[PDB]
């Protein structure tokens, strides 16, 4: 249906779906808008991000609940329990992987290559890193290794561009560094790198905070607070 829809209508419907807290619909409208093959605006990147993060966020939360139940059950080691939770965890996992694959598909087929500026390119590479990270959370074995590498590569490319092209207090740059630090700590079992990145990011942002435009001040200071909170947690 969506191929022939007016792009402007798809964006309007994404906004309506957001107001209605219909995030699966919102995501589908934004997928349709992306598939028109035009670059996204800032507002549209926000719509795309909010939609898919709500969907995958719900799935991640569900998966975590079920994985916990599954592991508790298995640990108890009763002769009669565990198959149903495993099956249902697998069902949710499959759905989560599907959404991540959709997002990564949009990034690879449309968004990364077609981005006309460094800021948006970094945003999309960050997003690629994030959705590989969400895949890594549920991956096992050798698949997990490859997925982790993919996340690392996307984040590293984003970091390299952001350091050359963007101020240290730019919200995209900050959000990328925060997420890459989380990757290091939670996924790559690299606490030293996580802490070093978070500390460097925090300090370099604080050093230039006095120059921040008012438009970004709230967002940048929020991310800096989260860096601080993670640093407190990790030390």
């Amino acid at each position: 249906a969506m191929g022939s829809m007016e792009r402007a209508s798809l964006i309007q419907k994404a906004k309506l779906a957001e107001q209605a807290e219909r995030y699966e619909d919102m995501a589908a409208f934004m997928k349709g808008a992306v598939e028109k093959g035009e670059e996204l605006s800032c507002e549209e990147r926000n719509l795309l991000s909010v939609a898919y993060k709500n969907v995958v966020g719900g799935q991640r939360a569900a998966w975590r609940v079920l994985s916990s139940i599954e592991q508790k059950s298995n640990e108890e080691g009763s002769e009669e329990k565990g198959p149903e939770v495993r099956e249902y965890r697998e069902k949710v996992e499959t759905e989560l992987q599907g959404v991540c694959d959709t997002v990564l598909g949009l990034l690879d087929s449309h968004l990364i290559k077609e981005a006309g500026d460094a800021e948006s390119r970094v945003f999309y590479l960050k997003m690629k890193g994030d959705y590989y990270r969400y895949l890594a959370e549920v991956a096992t074995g050798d698949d997990k290794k490859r997925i982790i590498d993919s996340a690392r590569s996307a984040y590293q490319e984003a970091m390299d561009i952001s350091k050359k092209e963007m101020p240290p207090t730019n919200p995209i740059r900050l959000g990328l560094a925060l997420n890459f630090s989380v990757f290091h700590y939670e996924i790559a079992n690299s606490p030293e790198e996580a802490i070093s990145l978070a500390k460097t990011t925090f300090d370099e942002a604080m050093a230039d905070l006095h120059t921040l435009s008012e438009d970004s001040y709230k967002d940048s200071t929020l991310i800096m607070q989260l860096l601080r909170d993670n640093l407190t947690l990790w030390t």
């Binding site: 909010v50 630090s181 700590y185 996580a194 989260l226 993670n230 990790w234």
Partner: peptide
């Protein structure tokens, strides 16, 4: 407590 990533806000 899990580490906090970038929040899902505009």
């Amino acid at each position: 407590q899990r580490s906090t990533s970038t929040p899902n806000v505009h």
